Design a binder for this molecule. Structure first.
Ligand SMILES: CCc1cc(C(=O)O)c2c(c1)C(=O)C=C2
Length: 503
């Protein structure tokens, strides 16, 4: 069962239930299938064929998810163009991907119009809410692609065929099978609670971005509705969440930090205690989970994955339950190897059951040996129960007397202190020790804090060789965090510090 046919099967058996909703709109499973079918007929009527590449360039709307499924239905390769791309970058991807069609919305098209229309390989350009004076040459209004009824023509889709190209300047090629296996990984990470009185799934990452594509396919295949928000909706996220009350929210760590910060004001208070929230990336969200529980009483989850691995590969279904920084457990079929360093800690290597096909180089696919391991650049230790303790980036590792020291582990200890609001640990060169550990300490509250408190606190909680040699008290840590750039600004930091304490 490929991704479209899995959607279809569910839509035909659960026709009346809401598949997608926004603040002002909704569409049932059955009507979304009808829209997908009309788009498929319009594409084929416009001479789009299995294997043709379609660049897709639009904000969150029902047409975006319908277009993904229409491409899948007919075997057209979809090429999502991130909304963060400049006009020159969008043109580069349209050209590099060898797209022969483009589908976009009004805002994205008109920001990029001259570039898109100068891509001479584009035989069809469809634009939602195209201005009528611009319907000419190969540029068409979106309504044209759905104007004809479904023609019931067959499609022969095979799981080894290309389905999509997800650009990181590297076009990662997914087959129909990659997408099946990536959605199957993602399905394991979407676990709303049982309602008390139907779950709606929200992803705060744009639907043009691969993690949200997978979340959306997986949610619909589990029969959940998907809530789509606009940029303005997400700028007003606290009020939007009170109104829409999703059961499950995916987002970046930054998304959830902002949600936390909005509560410091407000009044009516947003109740996320029953909501399952999933922070997504290539790091660890343990400190965020502590803040998120304090603020909402909700138990943050995390997902760790990347496009080259097809989908999510490691999932932490309860970050806050683990006192150490951790990233969770490998998903089903995921294989891991921890590089042997003659110790329990090493680089995390991953092989995923969602095998990408290769890299599109503009002219051909550079094929991936299906046995390849991906080196993540992250250090881990695997506990007895499988949980991957997170030791930080390999390149942030500090050496003390020959032994590796991990800033993220020291930071996690420091912030548990009631008087410490935040902390960043890094090293500086030292003529005779090689490196020396510095701790940037941001005092909590409106409170006072003496370094001697910290050194004694660390004696009880950390091995001595992991201890900072020096404390820099500053009541705002520079963010925008790069322990490398902070090391480079060590003398500046000391000169701006509330106080410095050298042991
Ligand atoms: C589709 C591959 C993938 C991409 C990304 C991303 O941050 O872009 C993420 C994950 C998977 C994930 O499990 C959490 C973040």
């Amino acid at each position: 069962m490929n991704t479209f046919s899995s959607f279809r099967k569910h839509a035909l058996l659960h026709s009346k239930e809401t598949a997608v909703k926004s603040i002002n709109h909704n569409i049932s499973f059955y009507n979304l299938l009808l829209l997908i079918q009309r788009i498929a007929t319009g594409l084929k009527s416009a001479n789009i064929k299995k294997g043709d590449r379609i660049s897709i360039h639009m904000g969150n709307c029902f047409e975006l998810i319908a277009t993904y499924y229409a491409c899948l239905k007919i075997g057209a390769v979809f090429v999502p163009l991130s909304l963060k791309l400049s006009a020159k970058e969008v043109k580069n991807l349209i050209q590099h991907s060898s797209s022969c069609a483009y589908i976009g919305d009004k805002k994205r098209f008109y920001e990029t119009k001259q570039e898109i229309e100068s891509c001479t390989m584009l035989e069809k350009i469809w634009v939602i809410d195209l201005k009528i004076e611009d319907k000419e040459n190969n540029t068409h209004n979106w309504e044209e692609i759905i104007s004809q009824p479904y023609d019931y023509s067959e499609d022969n889709i095979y799981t080894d065929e290309i389905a999509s190209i997800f650009y990181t300047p590297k076009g990662i090629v997914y087959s129909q099978k990659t997408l099946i296996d990536a959605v199957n990984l993602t399905k394991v990470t979407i676990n709303p609670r049982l309602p008390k009185s139907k779950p709606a799934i929200l992803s705060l990452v744009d639907l043009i971005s691969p993690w949200s594509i997978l979340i959306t396919f997986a949610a619909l295949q589990k029969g959940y509705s998907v809530l789509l928000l606009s940029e303005v909706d997400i700028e007003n996220i606290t009020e939007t969440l009170k109104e829409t009350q999703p059961a499950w929210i995916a987002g970046t760590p930054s998304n959830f930090h902002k949600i936390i910060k909005n509560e410091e004001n407000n009044n009516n208070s947003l109740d996320l205690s029953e909501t399952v929230c999933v922070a997504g990336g290539d790091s660890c969200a343990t400190e965020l989970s502590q803040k998120f529980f304090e603020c909402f009483g909700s138990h943050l989850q995390s997902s760790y994955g990347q496009t080259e691995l097809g989908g999510p590969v490691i999932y932490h279904h309860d970050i806050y339950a683990i006192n150490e920084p951790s990233i969770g457990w490998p998903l089903p079929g995921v294989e891991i190897k921890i590089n042997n360093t003659q110790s329990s800690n090493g680089e995390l290597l991953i092989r995923s059951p969602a095998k990408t096909i290769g890299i599109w180089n503009g002219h051909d696919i550079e094929l991936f040996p299906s046995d390849r391991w991906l080196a993540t650049g992250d250090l881990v230790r695997q506990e007895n129960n499988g949980n991957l303790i997170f030791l930080g980036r390999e390149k942030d590792q500090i050496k003390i007397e020959g032994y590796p020291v991990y800033p993220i582990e020291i930071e996690n200890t420091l912030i548990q202190h009631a008087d410490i609001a935040a902390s960043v640990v890094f090293s500086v060169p030292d003529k005779y020790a090689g490196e020396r550990i510095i701790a940037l300490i941001q005092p909590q509250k409106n409170h006072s804090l003496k370094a001697e408190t910290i050194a004694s606190y660390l004696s009880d909680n950390l091995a001595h060789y992991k201890h900072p040699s020096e404390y820099i008290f500053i009541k705002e840590i520079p963010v925008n965090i790069s322990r490398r750039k902070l090391s480079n600004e060590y003398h500046l930091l000391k000169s701006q510090a509330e106080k410095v304490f050298t042991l």
